[PDB]
Design a protein around this ligand. Structure first.
Ligand code: NDP
Ligand code: ZN
Lengths: 96, 129, 342, 87, 146, 209, 115
């Protein structure tokens, strides 16, 4: 979800938004900023949480060799769905 | 031992004029040495064995564009190497440069006794290995 | 200063000086040199261009990456100004046409647009403004060059309270159409000037002295409101220009004191060519008119910029006119013109 | 003001030249201080430095005298004359 | 864990009060002129100083020299140290004379009005190492802190 | 050498260069300081500065050495060593298909009489050394700045010379000519500290000096 | 170890000697290099440019180095005589584009953190 600034300046996922007083905004008129509308924060948020009944789940991320190293995910935290640092896919432990 | 019309040079060598560094960069440049302290997170020691020629850091203004650290200090990126401080100062004086000294960080004697870690009337007993 | 407007650097190409000098109409002479000076220590000089981008292409090399931001603009369009000076912390006016165009009445080039850019800049939120007037600016003078200059000079003065108005004398440079002009009577004819030159004393000034004046006026805070006049080091009676210029170029000296009556006819005939009015009726009495002393307003000399003599650098513009047999001749072979001055 | 404000000595712990002042501040130091519940003497003792004297008079008037190999009885003479003229 | 403090609330420009007494961004000339004007017509006790806690000795020398040339020799500090006696006189009165590297073999340490666990963490670390190895006996007067 | 990872060693010629190294050493012991060979069958005999003439004149003319193919005239700055500049020769024997290499030591000022006589190939190399490292050579026919820019300042491969340099260039309209301003980089060279603080090779380790 | 090999200057006088005709050639060199290279520089400020270059480095006393600038200055002259060097190279000594670096501590202070 891209957000706009008061001067109509759409913000990027990093949060950069040049204010009106910034002289560095003059390259922006007559032209445009390229904004990755697919904000990386919310195309992972809508992804569901898979249910695997094990204490440690591999996280290859699909594609076999095409993915991220198979860092093993610890699954015993009931209050925290264990997510992978590489791909961010949240993994869960069946509700006992 | 090298007798070919040798000149008895009694004055310290000053090759500063040949290298042709800018005049603002030979006087307004404090040049310092020390033997690097070991990176505390890394227990390895095979880096604190050499002296180096490093300089003073000038200003680093952010670029008007995307934001690279634009610098105008050519001498900043000049980390040299030196086996001993005597050779380090020899380079420093040979092209006479405003310099300071620093003493080699020398380890102390770690009196280690694994038998001490367990004791009867001594308090160095360790509760958990 | 603003969060990023704060200056930084050793005055290099990629050093931010914090001055955002949107110059108006920089595609010629003084515009070329000021941006060269503006871009030397690094500055976001937004140049609104109106001609073909090709003719503006040569302004690119004198700016760092993302510095010379050419912007489309039109004189009539009110919003055209407001977009190019919206974020510019300083505005340097340079608009004006020394010759005439049917669509651009001579009133406009010194009254309409100069007023049309001064009020928007003050409405935008700028700090400074520099509109370039003439050292001889005088409406009552028969010079439409002077007539339009003076009225526009006070309009921007009235519109902009901090309007640091500059009134340079007859500037000279590589493309000044003043030195290369005065070399051109040999090509055109027998030097049809008035009264053999013994009726007009002028004080030419080298452009870099002028351009260094504005940038020094930029850093000077007290320059606001004050109306500095940029004057050369020495004056020069008109005849001395003609013989000296014909000397530093090794041209056949053919002076002729053609009176003002017939010399006015050749002005319109030079405007007849519907591509460029080489010489105009305004330019007829423009050179006949002499330069007033104007001693009360401060000059560049007290501003830190000295004045370079004309005879110090002439062939730098005039070696092009020197023929092959004498292209190698410098100042020293040529006698200096009689310094009719203070 | 003609009066001295900070009378600064600079002596060494081991220097034989500093031995004279070392004897000075061993016996007559307390007498010098109790006579002056006011403007003090600044010792700032150091190592391997020739004994040295700075007189920080008022209104930026400073001057130095050397005391290398100078006995305790007459280093008091030396400070006496500089502090003699103070009013 | 103090680098982030460098970035928060950092003074960058000569900061002076406007006609409303509100601090505003001004060039160095105005700030220099403001201070210079009000120091020329003030001498002696009219000028003084309050030393902070994290200012190097180089500025300390400069501020001593600046005040003394005005004859404003009232170079005051923040941490009040009793002037009575030979406090400023003898260096011994305001020094850790035994040195942190020397406190190892001390049998008993009489800490006076101190909480070195937080007052000087490195000092407390050295006692603890000497406490564990050299059988150092510490003794603290005042609060029964940990 | 059943394992295919490491390269096999070759001992028959390995002993041959050492025998030839002693053979050269005995003939001219006035100038050979020390001679040695490495694992990769590369022998190096070390000469004194004023020895550029006869040692190469030896290898160029000897009936049993006849090393005539001049390979390269390199220099290696070592700031620690007093004679930091180390002029390195390299010769190839056509008949005996071997590569001799002689190197000397030289200060910034101390010259070397030009070895263009033994090998005129060195002449064109010799220009580069004074351009590239800056060591002047005595009685050289024409020892010129040939590879660096016109009117350059200093010697770029002295390890005290910045990688970026000292002067940058741009075309300036107000002079209509290229002006050499001092360098002002858009981005600073992000140096990388690439030195593992653990022992790399116990073999070549320097003992406590 | 004070006794070392000399290049050309066995003594100070020979170092003083070589500087002499080096200036003799270079003093005879300024008027024409301007003339051929079409430099807009009068002969006079060309001549004393060589002058203050000459004592911009005339302070060192070691005889081994002084003649090294002699040959360095010697061959900087050779490269100029035969139109190898161009307009930018001759002008390069005549520093133009950069503003004067600061003179008073006030000017050092106002520019930036640089000393
Ligand atoms: N000796 C002299 O010549 C002196 C001149 N002046 C004044 O200084 C000003 C600049 O001089 P100089 O740089 O030599 O002049 P040039 O003719 O070389 O350049 C004039 C500039 O004005 C711009 N301009 C003028 N009118 C318009 C318009 N209606 N719309 C858009 N752009 C316009 C031109 O843009 P474009 O090229 O696209 O048309 C061009 O960039 C002029 O007003 C001149 O009269 C002042 C004192 C002395
Ligand atoms: Zn994953």
């Amino acid at each position: 979800g891209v957000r706009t600034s008061p001067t109509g300046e759409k913000v990027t996922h990093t949060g950069q938004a040049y204010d009106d007083g910034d002289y560095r905004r003059v390259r922006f008129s007559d032209r445009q900023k390229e904004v990755n509308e697919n904000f990386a924060i919310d195309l992972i948020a809508e992804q569901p949480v898979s249910e695997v009944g094990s204490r440690v789940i591999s996280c290859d991320g699909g594609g076999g060799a095409l993915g991220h190293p198979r860092v093993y995910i610890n699954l015993d935290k009931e209050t925290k769905t264990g997510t992978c640092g590489y791909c961010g896919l949240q993994f869960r432990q069946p509700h006992h | 031992t090298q007798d070919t019309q040798l000149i008895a040079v009694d004055e310290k060598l000053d090759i500063t004029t040949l290298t042709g560094v800018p005049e603002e960069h030979i006087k307004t440049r404090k040049v310092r040495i020390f033997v690097p302290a070991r990176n505390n997170m890394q227990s390895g020691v095979n880096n604190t064995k050499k002296w180096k020629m490093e300089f003073d850091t000038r200003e680093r203004w952010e670029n008007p564009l995307m934001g690279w650290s634009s610098t105008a200090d050519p001498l900043s990126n000049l980390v040299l190497t030196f086996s001993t401080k005597e050779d380090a100062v020899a380079f420093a004086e040979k092209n006479g440069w405003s310099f300071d000294v620093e003493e080699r960080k020398v380890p102390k004697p770690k009196s280690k006794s694994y038998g001490a870690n367990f004791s009867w009337n001594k308090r160095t007993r360790v509760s958990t290995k | 200063l603003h969060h990023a407007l704060i200056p930084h650097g050793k005055g290099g190409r990629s050093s931010v000086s914090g001055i955002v000098a949107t110059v108006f109409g920089a595609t010629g002479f003084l515009g070329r040199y000021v941006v060269n000076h503006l871009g030397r220590m690094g500055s976001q000089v937004i140049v609104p261009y109106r001609c073909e981008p090709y003719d503006t292409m040569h302004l690119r090399p004198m700016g760092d990456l993302g510095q010379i931001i050419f912007m489309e603009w039109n004189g009539k369009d009110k919003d055209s100004i407001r977009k190019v000076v919206e974020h510019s912390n300083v505005v340097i006016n340079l608009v004006g046409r020394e010759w005439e165009t049917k669509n651009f009445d001579f009133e406009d080039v010194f009254v309409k647009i100069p007023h049309a850019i001064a009020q928007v800049s003050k409405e935008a939120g700028v700090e400074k403004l520099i509109h370039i007037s003439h050292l001889n600016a005088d409406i009552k003078s028969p010079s439409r060059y002077l007539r339009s200059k003076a009225v526009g000079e006070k309009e921007v003065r009235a519109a902009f309270p901090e309007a640091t108005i500059i009134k340079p004398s007859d500037i000279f440079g590589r493309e000044d159409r003043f030195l290369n002009y005065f070399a051109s009577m040999r090509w055109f004819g027998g030097v049809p000037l008035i009264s053999l030159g013994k009726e007009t004393v002028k004080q030419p000034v080298y452009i870099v002295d002028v351009s260094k004046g504005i940038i020094n006026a930029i850093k000077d805070p007290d320059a606001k409101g004050k109306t500095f006049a940029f004057v050369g080091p020495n004056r020069y009676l008109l005849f001395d220009l003609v013989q000296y210029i014909f000397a530093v170029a090794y041209r056949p000296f053919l002076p002729y004191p053609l009176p003002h009556f017939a010399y006015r006819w050749v002005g319109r005939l030079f405007e007849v060519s519907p591509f460029e009015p080489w010489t105009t009726r305004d330019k007829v009495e423009r050179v006949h008119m002499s330069d007033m002393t104007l001693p009360h307003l401060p000059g560049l000399e007290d501003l830190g910029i000295q004045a370079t003599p004309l005879e110090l650098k002439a062939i730098e513009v005039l070696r092009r006119h020197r023929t092959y047999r004498w292209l190698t001749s410098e100042m020293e072979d040529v006698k200096p013109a009689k310094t009719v001055n203070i | 003001k003609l009066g001295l404000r900070e009378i600064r000595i600079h002596l060494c712990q081991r220097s034989p030249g500093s031995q004279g002042v070392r004897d000075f501040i061993e016996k007559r130091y307390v007498e010098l201080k109790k006579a002056n519940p006011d403007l003090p003497i600044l010792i700032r003792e150091c190592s391997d430095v020739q004994p040295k004297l700075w007189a920080r008079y008022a209104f930026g008037q400073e001057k130095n005298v050397s005391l290398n190999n100078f006995s305790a009885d007459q280093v008091t003479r030396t400070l006496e004359n500089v502090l003699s003229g103070k009013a | 864990f103090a680098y982030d403090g460098l970035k928060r609330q950092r003074l960058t420009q000569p900061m002076i009060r406007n006609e409303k007494g509100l601090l505003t961004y001004t060039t160095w000339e105005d700030a220099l002129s403001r201070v210079a004007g009000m120091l020329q017509s003030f001498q002696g006790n009219d000028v003084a100083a309050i030393a902070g806690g994290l200012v190097d000795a180089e500025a300390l020398v400069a501020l001593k020299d600046l005040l003394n040339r005005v004859d404003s020799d009232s170079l005051c500090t923040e941490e009040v140290f009793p002037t009575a006696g030979a406090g400023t006189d003898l260096r011994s009165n305001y020094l850790l004379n035994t040195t942190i590297a020397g406190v190892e073999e001390a049998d008993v340490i009489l800490l006076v009005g101190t909480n070195p666990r937080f007052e000087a963490p490195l000092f407390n670390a050295r006692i603890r190492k000497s406490w564990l190895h050299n059988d150092l006996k510490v003794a603290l007067i005042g609060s029964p802190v940990d | 050498d059943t394992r295919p990872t490491i390269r096999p060693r070759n001992d028959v010629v390995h002993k041959q260069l050492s025998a030839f190294g002693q053979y050269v050493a005995e003939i001219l012991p006035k100038y050979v300081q020390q001679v040695q060979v490495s694992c990769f069958n590369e022998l190096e005999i070390f000469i004194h500065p004023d020895g550029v003439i006869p040692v190469l004149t030896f290898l160029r003319d000897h009936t049993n050495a006849q090393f005539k193919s001049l390979a390269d005239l390199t220099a290696v700055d070592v700031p620690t060593r007093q004679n930091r500049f180390e002029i390195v020769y390299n010769l190839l024997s056509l008949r005996f298909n071997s590569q001799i290499r002689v190197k000397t030591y030289t200060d910034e000022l101390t010259p070397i009489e030009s070895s263009v006589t033994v090998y005129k190939a060195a002449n064109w190399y010799e220009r580069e050394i004074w351009d590239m490292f800056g060591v002047f050579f005595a009685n050289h026919p024409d020892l010129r700045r040939i590879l660096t820019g016109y009117g350059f300042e200093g010697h770029p491969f002295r390890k005290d010379f910045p990688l970026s340099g000292y002067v940058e260039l741009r075309y300036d309209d107000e002079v209509k000519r290229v002006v050499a301003e001092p360098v002002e980089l858009a981005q600073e060279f992000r140096k990388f500290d690439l030195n593992s603080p653990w022992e790399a090779f116990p073999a070549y380790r320097q003992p406590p000096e | 170890g004070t006794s070392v090999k000399p290049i050309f200057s066995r003594d100070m006088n020979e170092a003083k000697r070589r500087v002499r005709e080096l200036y003799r050639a270079w003093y005879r060199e300024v008027p024409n290099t301007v003339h051929l290279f079409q430099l807009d520089i009068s002969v006079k400020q060309g001549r004393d440019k060589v002058r203050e270059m000459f004592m911009k480095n005339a302070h060192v006393t070691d005889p081994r180095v002084v003649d090294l600038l002699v040959i360095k200055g010697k061959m900087e002259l050779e490269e100029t005589i035969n139109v190898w060097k161009q307009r930018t190279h001759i002008m390069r000594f005549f520093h133009e584009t950069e503003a004067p670096r600061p003179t008073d501590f006030l000017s050092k202070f106002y520019v930036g953190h640089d000393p």
